[PDB]
Design a protein around this nucleic acid. Structure first.
Ligand code: NA
Ligand code: NA
Ligand code: NA
Ligand code: ZN
Lengths: 256, 223, 243, 282, 210, 299
RNA sequence: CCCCCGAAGGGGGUUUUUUUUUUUUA
């Protein structure tokens, strides 16, 4: 986990930088850890999701909606992130919030037209994230939970706007996924464990939508101890790795 | 999905969408189902046992006559189950001392009448409150009884569900009172039932004409 | 205005005056996040309670040589109500009052003195809200604290009772909490002794005692429920651990 | 088995009993303070909780992490309710007994042990609050190297004469009673648990070195990963961890040629039930 | 506000390729300081950095230096707080790669970047602003006597900011936020040219000035 | 830290005194302190004295804009910020403190939310104007009973206060100094009074949780020495309409329900006296003011 | 006071919106 000794860090790094890389649990560089997801458990919300990882990292996402004038509210999708044990003022929380807001920007994050009701009114989507537990960078965790929540989100059906009392339409949209990668030496790792993230030379946040490597893309320090520079071919490796191993995450998440 | 509970109880989730002016808000409530709702008939033997007292420790009075007004076949031993419209149009006839002696007022009808006309709802509540030897009006919470509660199908307006609930109420009534032979007559003006696997369904004027004192009250009805 | 209490003795949700809402609880729901944990559903109230500790104090202040430090964190999420709140509730005086109330409640129940130089952090997340949320918080805390193996003298059962005119209604929902005054009770075990007694709106004195009478009873039932879960969860996880 | 009791429940109206943990009392009435099993040992009546943090006991063998460097002492995380202490005079200094107390080495404490270092130690004694006092004076105690750390609930660590074991594949396991587990490359010291050995013992002049064995083959590393995964597998099945169960877990896991496969749920459960079945049949 | 004079509450607010100048050591109450002004056609920017440190830290002993970075809006409240903190985090990563933190145990280095002026006459500007932030922070760190393994540089092209060290051989920073879709290589090349120029200018400034 | 160091002998002494039906200041267990209410100068300025406990309240108002949500209601806030003047154990403005938050919440629930003040009577014009009445409590000396003293001070102040008469011509209003037109009082609907019961456990915790013959001691309006040693605290706010305005038993020593009820009723017995006292003192103040005016018009 | 020694020394207390006025009056 976090706060490993120098000996532990050296061992882990040597295993993770060797060719091929030896991950502490024997995972392949592109292999994810077992997670499970539940949806539709919050009746009051339009959508809902809960994701649990094998290391204990647990996240909860709620999808709510409200009618707004486009003209007065140009942003039809707002992401609010609440991490337990972290104040709303915290740097990492606002960073994640900004990032997620950009991945999901109505501009080109998702298709804004799917939200439109009338030429003057639409549904604003409130995505509320509650990170119960996290031992690594929760950006992918949150992203996946949001994906699941949006793919199981139902909205009131239109018939000033008036709505059907009992019938609701499934929100149809292709939600984006955000991936996190660990750069260790000359090796790229998907779904980095806490101990892996403690010794990683750097990190790559790579967004993904409709089967394309989309923005935002970030380089992110997974720690402060071993942050080193990296060669561009590694960045290319990460991108290729995502676009190679993303459609299976998409088909795994979208099969219900 | 519904959950069974400790003492003949149940719960489901009534979900719908309120449309306050200029907005949409989905509302979720818990709807409990029960097995102790009394038919309030003097003829029923089973219900007085499963019944429980109120907050004042009071066991609701069974007031519906053991021997109601009896008509010509295929109607004997009949109780009257009203529809919202019939109440709205013939409320002043429902108050007439010489007709409608034994009337069942479904909860859902009470609610509909309340929504469309509060004074008429008050007069109906007055009828159910001041029930005596001369007139007998009861309220039956069909929505809270699992025996009678119907759940809304998709792509179906509220009206179909309401009338299907009244229909199920009448059906449970017929099945419940038949060991004594009390029939129930669903009086309505809205072309409710296309022949299905039943219940006596007569319009207002039809029910009036089946009455002994028809000539007295035939003209106490809006045209 | 509408039939909060019909002459037939039924409520809007279809309950009678002296019946609890659906009450279900789950224990050890977050084994990788906390020492003790509970997920609780009371009516439509959905709450996650996490107990972390006893553990080493974060600061080398806040350390007491004679007893453990007890902290309570109540997170009322913005999506707990029908209408999302654009404002956080974390620093509202209402929430602080609730937190200090729960702390001072379980300071007298939890044997803090046998855990000196430690800190017990209670982390609560209200996922869904539908009235009577205080008693729910209480119950969640009790469950989670017991799951943590942290010693205490007894259960504390939380319940709410509204007062409609002359008649009291047990375990009020959101609609009942509005247009009616409510009393929240924190009852210790099976006793008649009250850990918590909260009245935030005007109530006729002469009718207060009666409101308590059913309340206590209700709380007792709640205890019987929580208990009933624990034993099962115990009986299950003490038999399977064998061989 | 035993009587399951909940907080506030009457355990006995008899006043003869002494009263241990998990109980409180009023006159002759004895009540439970936790949810757990009633325990009667001689005249000592207590209630054992189903769950709880590691409670350090005198003579326990634990693995810990240096949390704090302080005045003549270290604060070590054992995973208990409180940080354990490690007195400066309760450790071995690089060398023979000969070196006397210095003020200089007190000033360079961080050279021996610093924040983050993993060490294997023994619970010498307990303070009044129940926190542990540690010592590392035996040659088998000290800073841990050449391996990986993992942890399980302390209750799952069944106990024995030893907790440091030689496992096939040339890997030594250190099973701390607190649930903290260290998996290392088998050393010559580890090799010498039979029944120039003196030079071997003295060769560990450095027992505070931060450097690993420069030669750790890929085989040993893979085997480390596999042992870690199968220990976690036993933990997931809530199976008590013993040496034999660990090597049996390893061998049974050899079915899956890729160690990664061992992180899936059904595989963990399969390994667990394989071990239990094999144990019942033997 | 009890700590500020915000006036009446009833009131409401009124609604209605590039040259470089680099200087260091003009702020007297901090350890390091840097003034960076940039002028392109129909676009002018200017910002200041201040490095306070190495200072003491509250809390447990830390084995290495701890860097903080604070972006302050200048004049116009031009940007969102979340985006400012995001950029701050990015820069923190970069200079965590660049600064020799091992030299500064139990110590904190606080860096402040005042975005005084940012008026571009052309008629998401964060991207074009990041490389100048990096320039100024590297200059101020070198001015503060804070040890750097290299001179952190950066460039911007098509919404793609790339920060290099070691003559542009390796990457310490990568920021891509929309700003259209183009292939990676030419953005890399342009940003690398910008980086090399900025590097030359920065060393030059560090040789005429320090 | 700023802790009040209490010795074992003192705790044991006071507790044993409670066991023998003794209070240090010579009061019985059900005896509230003599309330001294003193008005002065302008309306809305009141000083309240309970034994050694000394508090001061200042009522004020200024024209403002009604909140967007509530178009017909005026604005009313109460401040109870402690200072080291009452005692060094208090930090300067720790509004997030336990007893601070509790006190503030109790007072707010007693006065601001009970509708003790007519907020709709504060409205000048629905859209653009309203009165912003403010009640600022100043804690001068702490010997316990701060909640009760605060409630009495706030109420007496609100009832004593008078806002300047005004009248309205559409867009514009016309505000008057005293010479122009006489001031008019606020709309007081009822008079909420708080009584604070302190609970002491003479025996062990085991007897409190699982013991019969409840020996839990209850006293009224505890002093500082008593407040520091108590195991429980209840605050009950009532008015002369036999209404339980509010009740707060925020944890502490578990008490039998019947005992709490008895507490409520005795509290009513006290709030009768206190209310009558407030009204009396008010009327005497007004009468003395009038007689002073009569002494001023003719030398 | 626990820890060694042997027969005194050294270490330690843990810095929500259920959908014609007035008065008395057969
Ligand atoms: Na209880
Ligand atoms: Na009950
Ligand atoms: Na530092
Ligand atoms: Zn019947």
């Amino acid at each position: 986990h976090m706060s490993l000794s120098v000996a532990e860090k050296s061992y882990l790094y040597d295993s993770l930088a060797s060719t091929p890389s030896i991950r502490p649990d024997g995972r392949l560089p592109h292999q994810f850890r077992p997670i499970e997801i539940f949806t539709d458990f919050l009746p009051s919300s339009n959508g809902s999701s809960r994701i649990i990882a094998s290391d204990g990292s647990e996240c909860i996402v709620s999808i709510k909606s409200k009618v707004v004038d486009h003209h007065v509210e140009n942003e039809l999708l707002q992401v609010d992130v609440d991490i337990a044990g972290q104040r709303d003022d915290a740097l990492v929380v606002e960073t994640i919030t900004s990032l997620l807001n950009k991945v999901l920007k109505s501009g080109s994050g998702v298709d804004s037209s799917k939200l439109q009701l009338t030429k003057k009114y639409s549904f604003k989507i409130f995505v509320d994230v509650l990170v119960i537990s996290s031992h690594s960078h929760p950006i992918s965790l949150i992203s996946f939970a949001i994906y699941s929540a949006l793919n199981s989100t139902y909205l009131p059906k239109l018939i000033l706007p008036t709505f059907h009392d009992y019938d609701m339409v499934k929100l149809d949209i292709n939600p984006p996924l955000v991936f996190i990668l660990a750069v260790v030496g000359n090796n790229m790792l998907l779904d980095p464990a806490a101990n892996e993230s403690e010794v990683a030379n750097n990190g790559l946040i790579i967004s993904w939508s409709n089967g394309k490597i989309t923005s935002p893309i970030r380089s992110v320090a997974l720690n402060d101890s071993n942050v080193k520079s990296f060669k561009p071919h590694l960045l290319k490796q990460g991108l290729a790795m995502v676009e190679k191993y993303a459609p299976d995450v998409v088909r795994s998440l979208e099969n219900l | 999905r519904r959950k069974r509970l400790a003492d003949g109880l149940s719960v489901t989730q009534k979900v719908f969408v309120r449309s306050r002016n200029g907005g949409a808000t989905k509302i979720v409530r818990e709807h409990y189902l029960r097995s102790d709702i009394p038919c309030l008939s003097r003829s029923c033997t089973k219900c007085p046992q499963i019944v429980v007292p109120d907050a004042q420790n009071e066991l609701p009075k069974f007031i519906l006559s053991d021997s109601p007004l009896e008509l010509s076949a295929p109607i004997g031993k009949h109780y009257v189950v009203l529809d919202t419209n019939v109440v709205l149009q013939a409320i002043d006839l429902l108050e007439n001392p010489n007709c409608f002696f034994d009337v069942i007022v479904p909860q859902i009808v009470l609610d509909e009448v309340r929504n469309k006309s509060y004074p008429v709802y008050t007069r109906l509540r007055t009828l159910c409150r001041d029930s005596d030897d001369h007139k007998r009006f009861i309220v039956f919470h069909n929505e809270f009884s699992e025996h009678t509660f119907v759940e809304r199908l998709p792509n179906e307006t509220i009206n179909d569900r309401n009338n299907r609930a009244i229909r199920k109420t009448c059906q449970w009534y017929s099945e419940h009172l038949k060991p004594y032979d009390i029939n129930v007559v669903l009086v309505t003006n809205d072309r409710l039932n296309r022949e299905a696997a039943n219940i006596i369904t007569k319009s207002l004027v039809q029910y009036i004409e089946l009455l002994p004192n028809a000539d007295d009250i035939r003209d106490s009805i809006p045209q | 205005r509408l039939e909060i209490y019909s002459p037939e003795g039924l409520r809007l949700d279809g309950r009678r005056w002296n019946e609890l809402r659906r009450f279900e609880s789950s224990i050890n729901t977050h084994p990788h996040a906390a020492d003790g944990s509970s997920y609780m559903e009371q009516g439509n109230n959905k709450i996650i309670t996490l107990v972390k500790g006893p553990k080493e104090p974060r600061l080398k202040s806040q350390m007491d040589t004679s007893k453990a430090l007890l902290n309570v964190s109540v997170n009322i999420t913005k999506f707990s109500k029908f209408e999302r709140s654009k404002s956080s509730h974390k620093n509202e005086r209402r929430v602080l009052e609730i937190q200090t109330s729960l702390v001072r409640m379980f300071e007298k129940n939890v044997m803090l003195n046998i855990y000196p130089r430690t800190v017990i952090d209670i982390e609560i997340h209200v996922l869904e809200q539908d009235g009577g949320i205080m008693g729910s918080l209480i119950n969640g805390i009790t469950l989670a604290l017991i799951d943590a193996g942290i010693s205490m003298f007894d259960y504390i059962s939380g319940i709410s009772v509204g007062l409609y005119d002359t008649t009291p209604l047990l375990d009020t929902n959101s609609l009942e909490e509005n247009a009616m005054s409510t009393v929240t009770l924190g009852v210790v075990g099976k006793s008649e002794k009250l850990s918590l007694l909260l009245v935030e709106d005007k109530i006729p004195l002469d009718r207060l005692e009666n409101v308590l009478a059913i309340g206590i009873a209700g709380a007792h039932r709640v205890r019987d429920l929580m208990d009933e879960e624990l034993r099962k969860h115990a009986q299950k996880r003490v038999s399977n651990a064998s061989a | 088995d035993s009587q399951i009791v909940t907080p506030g429940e009457l355990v006995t109206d008899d006043p003869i009993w002494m009263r241990g943990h998990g109980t409180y009392f009023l006159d002759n009435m004895t009540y439970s303070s936790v949810a757990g099993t009633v325990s009667r040992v001689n005249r000592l009546l207590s209630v054992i909780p189903l769950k709880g943090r590691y409670a350090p006991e005198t003579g326990d063998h634990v693995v810990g992490r240096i949390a704090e460097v302080g005045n003549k002492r270290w604060k070590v995380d054992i995973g208990g309710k409180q940080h354990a202490v490690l007195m400066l005079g309760s450790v071995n200094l690089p060398g023979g007994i000969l070196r006397r107390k210095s003020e200089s080495d007190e000033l360079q404490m961080r050279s021996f042990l610093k924040e983050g270092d993993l060490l294997n130690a023994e619970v010498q004694s307990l303070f009044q609050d129940g926190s542990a006092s540690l010592h590392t004076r035996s040659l088998k105690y000290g800073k841990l190297r050449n391996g990986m750390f993992c942890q399980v609930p302390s209750s799952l660590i069944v106990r024995a004469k030893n907790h440091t074991h030689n496992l096939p594949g040339n890997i030594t396991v250190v099973l701390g009673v607190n649930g903290y587990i260290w998996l290392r490359k088998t050393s010559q010291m580890d090799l010498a648990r039979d029944t120039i050995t003196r030079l071997e013992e003295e060769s560990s002049w450095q027992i505070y070195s931060d450097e690993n064995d420069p030669s750790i083959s890929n085989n040993i590393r893979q085997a480390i990963c596999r042992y870690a995964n199968v220990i976690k597998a036993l933990a997931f099945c809530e199976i008590g961890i013993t040496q034999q169960r660990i090597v049996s877990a390893y061998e049974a896991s050899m079915v899956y040629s890729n160690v990664g496969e061992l992180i899936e749920k059904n595989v963990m459960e399969s390994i667990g039930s394989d071990i239990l079945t094999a144990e019942k049949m033997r | 506000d009890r700590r500020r004079l915000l006036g009446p509450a009833a009131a409401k607010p009124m609604a209605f390729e590039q040259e470089l100048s680099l200087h260091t050591g003009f702020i007297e109450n901090c350890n390091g300081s840097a003034l960076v002004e940039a002028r392109s056609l129909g676009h002018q920017t200017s910002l200041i950095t201040a490095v306070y440190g190495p200072r003491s830290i509250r809390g447990s002993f830390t084995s290495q230096g701890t860097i903080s970075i604070q972006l302050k809006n200048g004049l116009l409240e031009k940007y969102n707080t979340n985006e400012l903190k995001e950029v701050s985090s990015f820069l923190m990563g970069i200079f965590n790669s660049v600064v020799n933190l091992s030299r500064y145990p139990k110590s904190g280095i606080d860096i402040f970047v005042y975005l005084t002026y940012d008026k571009d006459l052309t008629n998401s500007q964060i991207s074009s602003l990041i490389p100048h932030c990096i320039t100024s922070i590297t200059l101020a760190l070198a001015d503060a006597g804070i040890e750097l393994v290299d001179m952190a540089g950066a460039g911007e092209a098509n919404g793609t900011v790339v920060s290099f060290i070691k003559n542009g051989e390796e990457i310490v920073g990568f920021w891509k936020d929309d700003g259209d879709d183009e292939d990676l290589l030419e953005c890399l090349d342009r940003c690398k040219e910008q980086y090399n120029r900025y590097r030359d200018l920065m060393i030059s400034c560090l040789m005429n000035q320090e | 830290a700023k802790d009040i160091e209490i010795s074992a002998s003192e705790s044991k002494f006071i507790l044993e005194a409670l066991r023998q039906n003794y209070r240090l200041d010579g009061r019985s267990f059900d005896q509230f302190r003599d309330v001294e209410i003193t008005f002065g100068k302008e309306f809305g300025d009141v000083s309240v004295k309970m034994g050694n406990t000394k508090v001061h309240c200042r009522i004020s108002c200024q024209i403002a804009q009604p909140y967007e949500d509530r178009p017909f209601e005026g604005l009313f806030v109460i401040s109870t910020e402690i200072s080291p003047m009452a005692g060094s154990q208090f930090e300067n403005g720790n509004i997030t403190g336990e007893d601070e938050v509790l006190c503030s919440r109790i007072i707010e629930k007693s006065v601001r939310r009970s509708g003790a003040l007519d907020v709709e009577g504060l409205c000048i014009v629905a859209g653009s104007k309203c009165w912003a009445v403010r009640a600022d409590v100043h804690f001068l000396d702490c010997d316990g009973g701060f909640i009760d003293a605060s409630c009495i001070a706030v109420m007496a102040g609100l009832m004593h206060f008078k806002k300047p008469d005004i009248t309205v011509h559409g867009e514009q209003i016309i505000v008057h100094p005293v010479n122009e037109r006489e001031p008019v009082p606020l709309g007081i609907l009822h008079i909420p009074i708080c009584v604070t019961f302190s609970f002491f456990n003479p025996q062990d915790t085991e007897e409190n949780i699982k013991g019969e013959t409840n020996s839990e001691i209850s006293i009224i309006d505890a002093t500082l020495k008593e407040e520091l040693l108590r195991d429980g605290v209840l605050t009950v706010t009532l008015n002369k309409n036999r209404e339980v305005v509010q009740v707060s038993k925020a944890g502490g020593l578990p008490m039998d329900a019947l005992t709490l009820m008895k507490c409520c009723h005795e509290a009513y017995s006290i709030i009768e006296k206190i209310t009558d006292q407030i009204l009396q003192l008010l009327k005497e103040d007004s009468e003395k003011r009038n007689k002073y005016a009569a002494m001023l018009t003719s030398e």
